[PDB]
Each structure stands twice: as C-alpha cells, then as structure tokens.
Design a protein around this ligand. Sequence first.
Ligand SMILES: Cc1cc2nc3c(=O)[nH]c(=O)nc-3n(C[C@H](O)[C@H](O)[C@H](O)COP(=O)(O)OP(=O)(O)OC[C@H]3O[C@@H](n4cnc5c(N)ncnc54)[C@H](O)[C@@H]3O)c2cc1C
Ligand SMILES: Cc1cc2nc3c(=O)[nH]c(=O)nc-3n(C[C@H](O)[C@H](O)[C@H](O)COP(=O)(O)OP(=O)(O)OC[C@H]3O[C@@H](n4cnc5c(N)ncnc54)[C@H](O)[C@@H]3O)c2cc1C
Ligand SMILES: Cc1cc2nc3c(=O)[nH]c(=O)nc-3n(C[C@H](O)[C@H](O)[C@H](O)COP(=O)(O)OP(=O)(O)OC[C@H]3O[C@@H](n4cnc5c(N)ncnc54)[C@H](O)[C@@H]3O)c2cc1C
Ligand SMILES: Cc1cc2nc3c(=O)[nH]c(=O)nc-3n(C[C@H](O)[C@H](O)[C@H](O)COP(=O)(O)OP(=O)(O)OC[C@H]3O[C@@H](n4cnc5c(N)ncnc54)[C@H](O)[C@@H]3O)c2cc1C
Ligand SMILES: [Ca+2]
Ligand SMILES: [Ca+2]
Lengths: 446, 448, 455, 448
Amino acid sequence: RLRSTPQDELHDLLCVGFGPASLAIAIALHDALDPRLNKSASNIHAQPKICFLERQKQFAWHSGMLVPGSKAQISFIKDLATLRDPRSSFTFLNYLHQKGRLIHFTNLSTFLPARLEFEDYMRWCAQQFSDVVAYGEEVVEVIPGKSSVVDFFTVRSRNVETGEISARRTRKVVIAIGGTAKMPSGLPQDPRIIHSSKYCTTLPALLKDKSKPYNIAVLGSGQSAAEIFHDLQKRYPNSRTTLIMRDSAMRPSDDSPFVNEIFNPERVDKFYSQSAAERQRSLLADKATNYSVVRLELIEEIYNDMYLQRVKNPDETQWQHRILPERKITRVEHHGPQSRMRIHLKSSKPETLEVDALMVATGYNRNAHERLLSKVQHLRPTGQDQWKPHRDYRVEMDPSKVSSEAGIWLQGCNERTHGLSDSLLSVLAVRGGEMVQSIFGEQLER
Amino acid sequence: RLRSTPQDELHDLLCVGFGPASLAIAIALHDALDPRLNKSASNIHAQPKICFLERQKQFAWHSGMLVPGSKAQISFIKDLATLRDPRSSFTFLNYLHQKGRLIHFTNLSTFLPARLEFEDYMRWCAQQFSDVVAYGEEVVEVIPGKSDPSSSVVDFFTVRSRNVETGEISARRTRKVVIAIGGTAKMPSGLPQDPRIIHSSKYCTTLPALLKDKSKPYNIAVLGSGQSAAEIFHDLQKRYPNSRTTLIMRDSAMRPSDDSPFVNEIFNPERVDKFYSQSAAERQRSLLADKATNYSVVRLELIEEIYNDMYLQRVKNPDETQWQHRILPERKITRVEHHGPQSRMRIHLKSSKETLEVDALMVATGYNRNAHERLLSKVQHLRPTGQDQWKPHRDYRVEMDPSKVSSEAGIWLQGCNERTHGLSDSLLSVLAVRGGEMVQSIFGEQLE
Amino acid sequence: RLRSTPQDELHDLLCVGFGPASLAIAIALHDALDPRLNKSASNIHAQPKICFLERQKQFAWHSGMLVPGSKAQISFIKDLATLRDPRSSFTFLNYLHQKGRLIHFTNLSTFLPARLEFEDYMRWCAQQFSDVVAYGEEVVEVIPGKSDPSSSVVDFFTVRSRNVETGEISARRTRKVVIAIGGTAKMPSGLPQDPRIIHSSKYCTTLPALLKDKSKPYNIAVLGSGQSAAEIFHDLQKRYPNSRTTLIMRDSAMRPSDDSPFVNEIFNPERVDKFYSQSAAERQRSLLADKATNYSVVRLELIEEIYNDMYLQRVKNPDETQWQHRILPERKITRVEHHGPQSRMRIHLKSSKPESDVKETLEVDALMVATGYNRNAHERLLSKVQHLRPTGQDQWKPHRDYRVEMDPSKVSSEAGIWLQGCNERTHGLSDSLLSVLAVRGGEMVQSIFGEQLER
Amino acid sequence: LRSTPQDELHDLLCVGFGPASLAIAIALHDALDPRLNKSASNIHAQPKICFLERQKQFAWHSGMLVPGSKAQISFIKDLATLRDPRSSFTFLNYLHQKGRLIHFTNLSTFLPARLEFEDYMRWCAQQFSDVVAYGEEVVEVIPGKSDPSSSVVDFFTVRSRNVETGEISARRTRKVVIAIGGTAKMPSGLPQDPRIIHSSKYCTTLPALLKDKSKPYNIAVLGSGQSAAEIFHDLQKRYPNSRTTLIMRDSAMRPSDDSPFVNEIFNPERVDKFYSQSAAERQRSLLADKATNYSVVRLELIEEIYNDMYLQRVKNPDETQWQHRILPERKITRVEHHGPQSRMRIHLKSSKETLEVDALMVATGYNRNAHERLLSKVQHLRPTGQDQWKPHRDYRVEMDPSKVSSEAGIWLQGCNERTHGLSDSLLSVLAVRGGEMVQSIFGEQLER
Ligand SMILES: Cc1cc2nc3c(=O)[nH]c(=O)nc-3n(C[C@H](O)[C@H](O)[C@H](O)COP(=O)(O)OP(=O)(O)OC[C@H]3O[C@@H](n4cnc5c(N)ncnc54)[C@H](O)[C@@H]3O)c2cc1C
Ligand SMILES: Cc1cc2nc3c(=O)[nH]c(=O)nc-3n(C[C@H](O)[C@H](O)[C@H](O)COP(=O)(O)OP(=O)(O)OC[C@H]3O[C@@H](n4cnc5c(N)ncnc54)[C@H](O)[C@@H]3O)c2cc1C
Ligand SMILES: Cc1cc2nc3c(=O)[nH]c(=O)nc-3n(C[C@H](O)[C@H](O)[C@H](O)COP(=O)(O)OP(=O)(O)OC[C@H]3O[C@@H](n4cnc5c(N)ncnc54)[C@H](O)[C@@H]3O)c2cc1C
Ligand SMILES: Cc1cc2nc3c(=O)[nH]c(=O)nc-3n(C[C@H](O)[C@H](O)[C@H](O)COP(=O)(O)OP(=O)(O)OC[C@H]3O[C@@H](n4cnc5c(N)ncnc54)[C@H](O)[C@@H]3O)c2cc1C
Ligand SMILES: [Ca+2]
Ligand SMILES: [Ca+2]
C-alpha cells in the first residue's frame, strides 16, 4: 500500500539493498501506518518518502546456497514480523495461510522451514513493496549534499541492464547490503574456484555431467562447507569429494536454550552496553553459535556416511569422500590445458590433490559499506577511521558538519557493537520496528 | 467489547458451556465483528444478543487433570484462532507476546505447551468475554417456546440453569442454542459408587481431599491404559512418594500415540468436509481404522519415562511382584468390596482373556459425549418424524421438522459429533476453523 | 572350528538354508562345544555330523533390499549370540572389535546398524562355518529313509539338492532335518510375467540394470505401504532424480512402527513361551492386536522424510496432481497391462474401499512390488514325507521346540524335522525376525543335540 | 584372583579401588583366563596383587548419586568391552547375569542410570573381594631395600591408615599404582564452614545439615558444570519449599559436545597420538579440543532446567520473584559466616548483590595431585633435578636407574591428562588402558 516517490524528489529515507534486513524495515513501516496495528496511526494522512535500491532483478535470498533439503537455521517465530507483532499480516504463519499450506506445515512438526520456503515467504512479503523497490540498481556511492552543514545525501546507483548511473537525494540512508564473499588471499581467480555463495548457480554449469567421477574439494568447516560437502556426494554420486579444514574437527552449533538467548531481541541492549573489551570476549565465548559451526544433525549424517565407507574399506586415505583436518592450502597450480588443478596442502599446526573444482566456503566480509561511504567519511567526528553505530544503528557524525535531520544507518554489519544476531534473521522483526522509530518516529507523531 | 444482554431478554444465541469449543465461537464472532480483520465489518452497527452459561465458577480447562508437567497433546498452531486467521489477537503467539513471553517460549523449541500454560492462554482469551459469560450456571433443560402458543411453530427456546452456589434455577430465552458441554465421566458399569472411586476428571481436585497425607503409604490403583491413566499413574508416584500404585488395564500394554504426519491428516480442518460426506458405513469403518480413539493411547515420551521408572525398580529388586509400583496388564475388575469401616477397598481381578486392597481407585476410562440428549429431551419431539437421535448437518445444526420449528430458530451441537464429523470433533484440532463456520451458520444472514 | 562331515556319510543334522536362522544354530552349536562358554563341553571329544545347504552362491542377507542408507530394524544387542551369551565370540560388538571399528561404531550413538553392516557381521559369522556349508545348493525334496529293509519304520531322511550352476542332483542322508528357508515373494495374483515387474526382494539386483541411465525421466510405480515399499519409493527419488515415482497403497496412509517399550516386549525371547502356550483363538487375536510391529509399517523417521519431501513439492506447486512424486492411497491394482518390452506397462487402479469410484491409470517403465512374503515353501519340500504326519493333520504342526509332530509308529524318534522362521502362528511375530535367533539357536541345539551332548 | 598374605612382598599394590584400579583387576583376570587368550594355559602362578581403598565398600561418587542421574558415557565404554567384548566383565554380560539384558535393550539408551552403572562396577568389584583391602587410606609410600646396605631400592612399603581405628598398616610391593581420582577443588576465597559443602559430599552430607524438607531453605549452588546442574535440579525436588540460586562465572550453562568428530579425542587409540605430541601442542590441544571434562552440562538436563524456569515465568513474569534463580556472570567475593545467625551472607560481584543462604554447595571440580603428597618420601628416587612425576607412555614414572631396581616401579592412573589426554580421568579408555597396564606391569612375568 506504500505509494512511490518520484526518482528526482528529496526522499525521507533511502535503503541500500532489499534483502531481509531492508524488508523488515519496509514491513515495520507498513505496520506502523496500519491503523489496525497502531491505533495512533488513524490520524496519519502522510506517508514518508521511502525508496529501496536492490541490485538483483527480483527478491532473492542466498540463491547460491539454496541446496536441496537445506533449512533456514532459525525458528519460524523469528520471521520478519512476529516478534514485533504476531498480528502482522507479514508473519510466516499468515503467509502459509495465504498459500493454503498452514495445516500442511503444522503436520511437519518442525520449527525450521526449508530455505527454499523461507525465501518464498520473504518474496511474498516483498511483493507488497513493489512500488517502492527499484530492482536492478547497484548502489555505487553516497556523496554529501548541502542546502554550511550537510543536510542530505545523494545515492548513486548503476542500472544493471544498461549501465547508467542515476542519483537519488535523501535525508537519511540505510546500508543493508549483507556480506561479500570472503576468499583466502592465497587463492587465485579461476572458474574452477567457486565461492559457496555461487555454489548452486555456478558449479552445475562447470561440472555438467552428474555421472562423471569428478574430484571436488571443499574449503572450510562451517555450515555452508558441510552442506556443500554433503550435497556434492549426492549430486555427483561417483565424485571424489575432499573437505579441507584448518580446525581439527567439524564442531556443532550450540542449540541449548540458555546460550541461545544471545539471539533474543532484548539482548541487543545487553551486548551493546558492554565495553569493547567485554564485547570482544563475549563474541569468542559464544563462537559455538556463529556460521563457523555445523548443525549437529548434519555432522551426524556426514559422520554416518563416512562410517559406511569404513565398513567397506578400513583405510581412510582410500575413501571416496574424505575430510582432511588441520590442513592449509599453500599452492594452487591452475595454468595449462589440464582440466584439473593441483592443490598443495600442508599442516596448519605451528600432500597434493588434483581436483576439477574447489568450492570455497569461508564466509563473508561485512565492510563493503566502507567503499560506498568513502566520500562521506570526512563527516565523522575527528580522528575516527571507522564507522561507529549508535545503539539505534545510526553512525556518529560531527554535529558541526551534519544536520541533525540527516544521517546514515547501518544494518547487518554491526556484530562488533550489537552481537552475533546482527547479521542473522534473529532480531529483524524487532529491529525493523526500532529502525522505523529511530528514522520516522518524530515524522509520524503528526 | 461484546456488551452484555439482559438475562430476561430474548437472546439471539445462547451457548451451553464455556470451554474451548464455545470460547472459539466467541473468539470467531469477535473477529467477524472486527473491522480490522474483516473489511466488510465496518458497516455492522449491531452486536448480536449472545450469552454463555458455564457451570464452573471461572474459566477452567480439565482442572481435575492439571497434573504437574502435563503438556497439551496438540501443536500450539492449533490454538483457538490461528488456523482460521493468523492475524487474530486471540492467537497463542499474540497471547505470549502480550505476556512478554514470546521469545522465551521460542527458546523452548517445543510445539506442546504445558497444560498449565495452554489453560492460561484460554483463560486470557475468556476474560475478553466476561460481560457475556454467566459462570456457575449449570444448564439442566432446554424448553421449546412458542411466541404463538396457539400454533405448532416453535420459534424460541428457554434455557433453564441451576446456580451452583444458590441452587436456584434461572431461565433465559433464546431463538438459537449451542450445546458445547464436552463429555461426562464414563465409568465401568460394574463399579459401585464410593467416594474412594474417583474418575480421572476429578483427580487433582478430589483425591488430595480424600488422601491428605502426601507421605502416607497409600495403596492407590489406576484403572485404564490411555493418556490420563498414564499421567495419573506417573503423577501418583511423585505426589505420594511412599505409596504403592498399581496400573490395571485390560490391554496387554500401554500403546503410543501416533505422531506420524500422514495419519494425523485426519485431524486437518478440511477433512471434516470429506469425512462428513462419507457414508455411515464408511465413516464407521474409518473411525475403527484411521487411528486409535482420541486419548486411548499415550504420548511416547511418557510411556518411555514410566518404563524407565519401572526398569529402575528392576535394578533394585529383580522380583516384579515386590515392586512399589506395578502394571497389571490384561486384567478386568470383577468385584469391589467397599462396605465396612476399613479405609481400604478390596479389588478382585480376573484375566481379560488375585486381589488388591487399595485406599483409592482412580478410573481413567474416558468420557461419554451424549449429555445433550438429557438436556434436549423436552425438545426432541421437534425432530423430523421418527428420528430418535439428534442428527447434525455439516454445519452442526440439528435436523428439525420444518413445520414445527421456525427457520429463525434452531439448535447446534459442538464436540459430540465424532460419528458424523470425525475424530477431530472433540479435540482442540479444528476449533479455530469450526468457530468461524459456526459464526457463519448462526449469524451469517444476520451480519450481511 | 566345526569340522566337515563327508557328503555321503549319515549326518546328525542337515539344515536347509543358511540364512540368519540356520546361522544362529551353527553359532549356538559352536558355542555349546566351546569349553570357555560351557564348562561341561571340555569332556566332549566328538562333534555332531552337521551340514548346511544354501541355494545362494555365498552368504547374503536380503541383498535385493540393501538400499543406500537402509538400517537394520533391530537393536544390535539382538544379534545372533548376545542375548544367549554376551561372552560369545559371535556377538556384533566382538565383530566390530575384530574389524577394528568398535570405537567408531560407538561414536555413531545408534543401536540400529546399517543393513550393509549387519549383513557383513553375519557374513563374518558365516565364514567361520565354511567347512560345513554347501553353497549353490538348492534343496528340492526330502524323502523317507528306512535303514532296515526288514522294518517299515523311517529312521532317516535323504535330502536332494540341485546344484544351481551345474544342475546336478546330490543326495545327503541325515537323521534330522531343519528347514530354514525364509520366505518366497508374495506376488499379487493376475500379474503378467514381465521382467519390469520386480518384487522388492529383487530391487537392488534387477532394477538398476533395467533402468541403466540414472538421468532418464522414468515413470516408476511402487506397490505397498510397508517398510520396504517406503524405502524403495524414497530411494528411487534419489537414484533417478528426474523420475516420476508413484506409491500405490491399499491403506489410507503410511503407518509408523511402534517403538514403545511395553509393546515391543512381544519380541522378548522369553515371550515365546507365553505366546506358544496361548490357545489358537488367542494367538490369532494377539497377532491382530500387534499388526503395527512387523514389516507392514514404516519407521517414523522415514515417514517423516518422505512427508517432508512431499511438502517441498507442495511449496513449489499447490496442485498435488502435478507433483513429480505422488502417493495414491486407498487404491488397488485391478490389472497390469503390457505390450512387449518396447513399450510401457499400464497399471490400472481402483479404490480399495468396499464395493459401493475414482480410478486412475499409470504408464510406467517398471513396477516394484513390495508386498511381503509367503512362508510355506516347506510344504513342497516336505511333500514326499508328509504321509508320516499323525492321522488327520493336513498341516505341519511344530511343537514348542519347533520339531514337527510325526506318527510314532511310522517314524523313529531318533529322526525328525524342525521348522524355523515360518511359525508365526504358533510362536509369535518374532519368529521370522532376527529378534529371538540367538536364544532360539540355543534351544535348537538342546532340542537337536542335547541328549547326544551329555554322552 | 587369590589373596596374598598382607605381610608378603607383593608384585603389585594399587592405591584406590575405583574404576581405574578395577579395570586393571579385570584386565589381569582376563589375561589369566586361558579361554580369553591361549597363552595363559601354561601360566601356573598368579601375580601377588592387592588393592587399597579408603571407602568401606566399592562406591562410585556416592556423594553425587542424585535420583535420575545418568552415566555420561556410552555403556560400550564399560570396563572391558573396548579391550575384549568376550570378557565376562562387560556391561552387557552383567545385565545377562542379572536377568535384565532384554529389559535394558528395550530402554534404547546408551546412558545407564548412574545407580545402575555403579551396581555394574560393584558386581565386577565383588569378584575381586579377596584382594581388595577396604577401609584403608594410603598415607605414604616409602623406599624399601631387601638388603639395607644396598644402594638400590628394590621395593616400596605402602602405609595406610585404618579409617575406623586410625591404625597405620604397612605392606611391601615391587610395584605401585596410584589410582586415587581427585580431591575436592575449593575456590581459594571460601572459608571453612560445615554449611559450605563440596559436590562430592552432596548426597551424603547435605541431608544431614538440612533435615527439614519442609523448611524454605535458601540454598546456593556455585558452578556451571554437570554436577552444579544436577545439584541445582535435584535441590528443587528434594527441598520443595527451598529457594535455590545457581551462581556461575559464565554467562550461561553450556552443553556437552556429543558430536562424533569432536569426540574422537576420547578414542583409546588417540592416546598414542596425543602422548607423542610436543608439550606445546598438547597444551594447545587441551584448551582447543574440547571444553574440560564435566565443565559442561548434558543437553537434556539443560533443557529440563530451562523448562522449569519457563514454568516459573508463566506463573510470574518477575524473575526476581522466582523461587529458583540463576545468576550468571558472578563471582563470590566475601562469605560472612560468624555470629549466632544460622545463615551465611554471600557477597557477589560481576565475574567480568548479596544472598543469605542456609547452605552453599560448591560444584567446582577436583584437583588430581594427591599423588604428590603420597609419594613425597620416594621422590628422591626420581632422575636428578625433577620436581614432578613424569609418566612414560605406559604410565610408569621415570626413576633414576642407579637408585631403583628395574623390577620395581610406580605407575600413575587418572592424573595424567596433561600427557595422555582428556580421557585420562574418565571411564573412556579404562578397558584398553587396563590391558596396557597389565602388559606393562606383568608382561615379562606372564611370559616366564
Ligand atoms: C546459506 C546461508 C549462509 C549464510 N552465511 C552467513 C555467514 O557466513 N555469516 C553470517 O553472519 N550470516 C550468514 N547468513 C545469514 C544471513 O546473513 C541472513 O540470513 C540474511 O540474509 C541477512 O539479511 P541482510 O539483508 O542483512 O543480507 P542479505 O540477505 O545479504 O541481503 C543483502 C542485499 O543487499 C543487496 N546488495 C548488496 N550490495 C548492493 C549494492 N551495492 N547495491 C544494491 N544492492 C545491494 C544484495 O543483493 C542483497 O539482496 C547465511 C544465511 C544463509 C541462508
Ligand atoms: C486432561 C484431558 C483429557 C482429555 N480426554 C479426552 C477424552 O477421553 N476423549 C476425547 O475425545 N477428548 C479428550 N480431551 C480433549 C478435550 O475434549 C479437548 O481438549 C477440549 O477440552 C474440548 O473442548 P470442549 O469445549 O468441546 O469441551 P470442554 O473442554 O469439555 O468444555 C465443556 C464445558 O462445558 C461445561 N459444561 C458441561 N456441562 C454443562 C452444563 N450442563 N451446563 C453448563 N455448562 C456445562 C464444562 O464446565 C466445560 O467448561 C482431553 C483433554 C484433556 C486436557
Ligand atoms: C529388507 C528386509 C525385508 C524383510 N521383510 C520381511 C517380511 O516382509 N516379513 C517378515 O516376517 N520378515 C521380514 N524381514 C526379516 C527377515 O525375515 C529376517 O531378517 C531374516 O532374514 C530371517 O532369517 P531366516 O534365515 O529365517 O530367512 P532368510 O533370511 O530369508 O533366509 C533363508 C535362506 O534360505 C535360503 N534358501 C531358501 N530356499 C532354499 C532352498 N530350497 N535350498 C537351499 N537354500 C534355500 C535362502 O537363500 C536364504 O539364504 C525382512 C528383513 C529385511 C532385511
Ligand atoms: C558425579 C561425577 C563427577 C565427575 N567429575 C569429574 C571432573 O570434575 N573431572 C574429571 O576429569 N572427571 C570427572 N568424573 C569422571 C570420573 O573421574 C570417572 O567416572 C571415574 O570415577 C574415574 O575413576 P578413577 O578410578 O581414576 O577415580 P575415582 O572414581 O575417583 O576413584 C578413585 C578411588 O580411590 C580412592 N582413594 C582416593 N585416595 C585414596 C587413598 N589415599 N587411599 C586409598 N584409596 C583412595 C577413592 O575413594 C576412590 O574410590 C566425574 C564422575 C562422576 C560420576
Ligand atoms: Ca508429527
Ligand atoms: Ca554422539
């Protein structure tokens, strides 16, 4: 129901990216304007000028990792609205109800929906914001705007179909662009070296004959590495897969209830108020719940598959599918007509593979906003070489350089100040409401 | 925000009972009148005259069986609203949200709330209808009423109820009636009446009064093999830790409740259409097959706990006959001596293909769901010629002779129609969706 | 350790079949003769003359159903020896220890080993009896033996077997026979002979060669609703990722196996005594009240995986009739049409509800038939000795110790025939399973060799 | 195994008769059984062995035999199976001897009740009753020379205190095993008080101090490991009216890692790999491989505790009103314990408030250095310049070969985590290590 703002109008808010983090904001604004949900909203006859710029052509959630049978790693109660307001029309249960699937999901007796299903849930939510989302727009920079002090920002984006740069002016910016693929710096660029974010979308084109005895290595030891390692053995049944990890063993995600309260929405306050030293220590003492570990059930499945090989062949080094713990890649030969690369391995404490492909499941960097924001970084307080978000995700600005009606918010990249949940689905519903209060609260009071 | 209607005024609808079945109807009416949930409802400036009569003094859900650690046997998604409209303020999740408990319930990673919690959820729902519920009113009869006594057309009903505190009988006039009164204690015909013979529905409320010393070495028997039998047997061992408890069952073993997904689709709301349209022979056969009767089996997790406790007794003493707590399978009670001053009764046992002396016998043999026949006996002459049973249509309205009953009047049955509507009829399973159907059936024309 | 007996010598015992039931007997005889396990056995310097005839070319356990990821449906404690004597060298745990895998199995935290592994365990057991098992020998008949031509009494039996590779008939003489031949494929009547109609017992061995290209969009139907049917249905969807598979079941839904502890006491070894002592009517009734515990039901975890897979199809397409993989409940096959191998078979479906009407037709490249087994092939094998039964018996009647009743005026008591695995009606649901083999094997040795082992 | 006269020179004396020593007794018994290895048939002389135990009978952490407590390790890791499944001393054969084997199988669990696994080891121990001296607390080990003028020690004299009379006894042996588990580790800041009880004394000491199950005791529990959790949960049932508070340094109770790759560090055959690593790698491995033994809580028990806390939330949203509470991220800084008052005041600071309590249970684990005290009078026989006992791979400690006969020696069991792995103090490798110990100690003897 959100009406569009003209491209050349001065916006109230422009959000960079339309993944789950921005979608939660759009939904929370929708709910804030809904007189059923907020009685206070009946006397609001003016909608904020809001716009979302998304690089993809339509809504999509980690399509490279939509592997068969993968689940969203979160209870469905942590969807994009329920923890803020279970009456919202954007709840997962109401989505299922609109699809005619609610009773069918109930009979699953599961809290974790299939990843494919959760993407569709979010695609369904997003379709209600089609008038304020510009798809196919890759944001390239944010530049200051003065109309003495800076009181707006110009967001420049490149149209993915034509290459043209267009500019939009806004008082407030949100950067919610997720992460960029983290590749170990020793690895060369090669079409046979594919990051996990491109697994489902790039690997099938490279290794086309599912029946061939490909040799395929997987680098990493977290959730995505194990899903890829496990999926490969089913997708290419005659393949020889090898998991290369620095750690000594795949480690389980801690699913226990007291520990997992770190993901509670009201815990963001607790984490934020801790000292930097304490936040750093707290992140380490809960490493057992980040993406570097693996769902216990998947570890068990992988271990069981490995055991079956042991039944047939007691010599682990001869197994079709192997795990190589405490190893590091030291060299990659990838030149010449030969279609296999040779990977050189050494112990990672203080051996060569010939593979048709190397999947690299080493996680993400979440500092791409620094590039986008480089032309506004002189507005930070004296001596700051990093963006510092307040509790409400607004970055600190020098008050003599920036008007109080203007600002920039960061979403998804604030683990260091806001906790492990910051990059996850965990607190998006509640945070979406907080963001709407922080950015539009005063404006809506009318 | 449903306003009360005067007791001696002619009501549009009166529901007998305020358990989950009536509460779901109340919630669905509230939701139909909510212009936020139903857009067409903004132009509805008239609330129906509605009243609920509940014999208990406050809202309560099987409080005789609120055993510590007892869980609801249904996924919480099957609450009183969600399967009809997940946006409703009467969902379990919104209830938790209002209590500040939503995230905390999430970290439980469970679909089955404690019975104590699901009761509180429905208690919290019920409070939004306090103006239209008369508690402590035990309905005793429904009387046909003719605005024109000189005609044969019955066009309203008078519902008379006995106040449980005063004994005084009061009457209310209504054009439409709902009977949603659950079940009455089904007792084996051979058991005599004795205050030491207590049905499972009175366990938590009556047994402590009879057996006051939590420490005394009571001998307590439990008759049955279903969910309630297992809960009492298990609870007794903690509540009276020095007691000697005996589970007596005709069957050879406690059997697990089927949690598998294909089988449990019989409980889906949309199966009511399919089941209802089946022939009497096919519904009868389907009820025998499809699944074991509701509550005649035991949650697997509870069987395993009880078996583990039994095994621990085996570690301590290999002789089963000397165990504190015992299960006696394939048994039936043939005689109960209960006369004379000795506080214990003597239970005589025979194979179902030996005597026990007990201070109490808990009877967990389920419920009858035909009490509406007694309540409706003075209106049964209004059924079509020759009907000796109440026949509900798909929408739960009972068949009436159209020349004897105004079409603006009728009677609906809730919770007792398993034979025509399926095993889900007496459960929480389809209450949310059924509540909406009921609001359409009774008020559909009136609202449009 | 068991030494062979020369083929043409008079045997003490000959077992027909060398599956788990006979293997349990071999293991229990070995253990009875082991002075470590039985003190009384050190003073036994004579081994019974024993022989086993197995039609397969080597030991194999339901190899047609060794489907990827399949589990044995039993706790490993119910292996071929432990419940009789955990100290036995033939326990599953000792097998694991000998293979150097015991700690690795422990880290599985499972009581159910893979079928492939449980087969290997029993293969490992069987190899220790290689001197007394004649493989590739299909027993064809059992005929009476009269050692005295001046006497009418039968005091031995001749067992004739047809070598499966040469066709040559061999005869072996024995005083006592055990028939432990498992079951034969129960096929719906009326089916045409076509190599694409494959019983579940031939699944892994026949279907892959028949449908060689794992990528082709085959149509494959599966008949049944029990464990094997569900495994085949699920396996097909993974083995042939582009296939359209259809599960046809007479029941309304796949039903779960009862894993609850009180019910599963029907499988306890000591329950055989209670079941056997019941009346015929009561045994028949008891078999009814425990139907949800055999191979006619499905492990819950597998039901859930199949249900989850179907749900994923629902996510992609709300129209069930357009799904790649489908379940057609409450249907029966009325006809299976074929037009030669160059063409597809047509399966015609009708409701299985009592005749009182929404039917279907399927065109399939193969039909898997997961309908269980018949367990009466001993009647054909024993047909030439059946006149030795007591007057008026038209069925073989096993006593508690599995020895069948004989007319004592026709048959010496030093001779006899025992049946294994086909005695559910008298001995309970566990009779055809691994459940009581360890203990039953010990009973069989006492019944067959007890007196002989005292002297 | 037949008894050696107290006064004779023994081949082996083991200090302690817990699981570690018992596995050695079992492995010697099996090594002597000609049926379990053919070699032993021509072995006509039994080693002279005895065991000293301070408890009056075999008991496994009886102070922590909490109702419903479980073994924390699969029963396959009993005292014999991983070395020889044929041994008569396996857990499954125990069950068979007891007529319980099929009954345990129907439990479908790998974790026996602690009560049952204790009884299994008690059943094993009774087969060695002739060679175990109970009631004897070893207090010192002193050098012994067959010729007092020899420069070489060829035996050890082991002195023990009769726990009933305090009499000191002496026995002579070529070879000594110290297998004495751990002693209570108490945070240095706590004073001595009868109301401050270590978890090892929970079941045997706390009920003596707090006898009134009705009185609402304020009971504090210090710790976050398996024992703190079992005690916290058990207190809430044992004293139903009590207020229990769990004090822990960590932010949360953390779960045991049950995942299979991680747990290969406990496999028997890892000892070889771990031992041969450098001191620097072993030290790093011990922090990194797994959170220390018993410092975490079995997942099932955390969920039970969590569910109990949630039920309190249902009854009352104000956590500070809860009868049973958890105070994470806390340290105790002062304990006031003098004066007439029966309660002590516990002072709390952040570990980066006050409680008045009737008792303080301290579940802070154990030290495993008591062998240093017991061996101080033989530590001059170590190689020059050593200040610690240094076990070889086969657990025999280094000795100066000019000072100690090669037919004499001392082994350590259960205190060698730093050289042999986390599994050293656990049940994990006892069966295999018992076999190794027998070959190390009696190998030559059992060839001759
Ligand atoms: C398979 C999988 C793996 C995961 N791995 C991790 C992990 O390793 N670590 C972790 O902390 N979380 C991980 N997560 C959790 C994940 O981050 C959340 O599930 C969720 O995706 C976060 O939403 P977000 O909107 O902040 O980021 P996203 O889901 O990434 O959304 C970001 C959006 O911004 C768009 N965008 C990016 N740059 C531009 C641009 N310049 N201009 C315009 N649009 C742009 C993208 O197209 C995208 O739609 C993973 C989740 C899954 C499903
Ligand atoms: C412990 C327990 C045991 C169960 N056992 C069974 C079982 O054996 N079989 C089965 O099919 N289902 C059983 N159920 C499921 C149960 O029926 C549903 O959970 C649910 O209670 C049905 O709602 P209902 O409103 O139709 O009946 P109820 O929950 O029974 O509500 C009926 C209401 O009517 C009131 N009432 C009764 N008579 C009168 C009267 N004359 N006048 C006025 N008010 C009256 C009662 O006070 C009550 O509030 C059980 C549930 C629980 C929790
Ligand atoms: C996949 C699978 C499916 C199962 N399905 C069922 C089922 O539907 N119903 C049920 O009650 N149990 C079933 N079981 C359990 C099964 O019967 C037991 O696991 C076990 O195989 C029984 O051992 P048995 O030795 O009595 O029979 P089998 O294991 O079948 O062994 C019989 C042996 O005799 C041999 N043999 C047969 N005829 C001759 C002959 N004329 N001459 C020489 N040798 C011969 C066979 O080759 C075979 O090796 C199934 C098990 C599995 C693994
Ligand atoms: C409740 C519980 C808590 C546990 N906590 C831990 C833990 O915090 N950390 C860890 O690594 N493992 C822990 N364990 C594992 C435990 O160590 C093993 O289960 C097992 O008990 C180890 O056997 P052990 O024989 O080496 O020691 P123990 O079981 O301790 O046995 C040692 C024996 O020696 C006796 N003894 C001691 N001193 C003398 C003496 N001077 N003279 C004579 N006898 C003596 C003792 O009485 C005792 O019987 C715990 C186990 C349980 C059940
Ligand atoms: Ca389920
Ligand atoms: Ca495990």
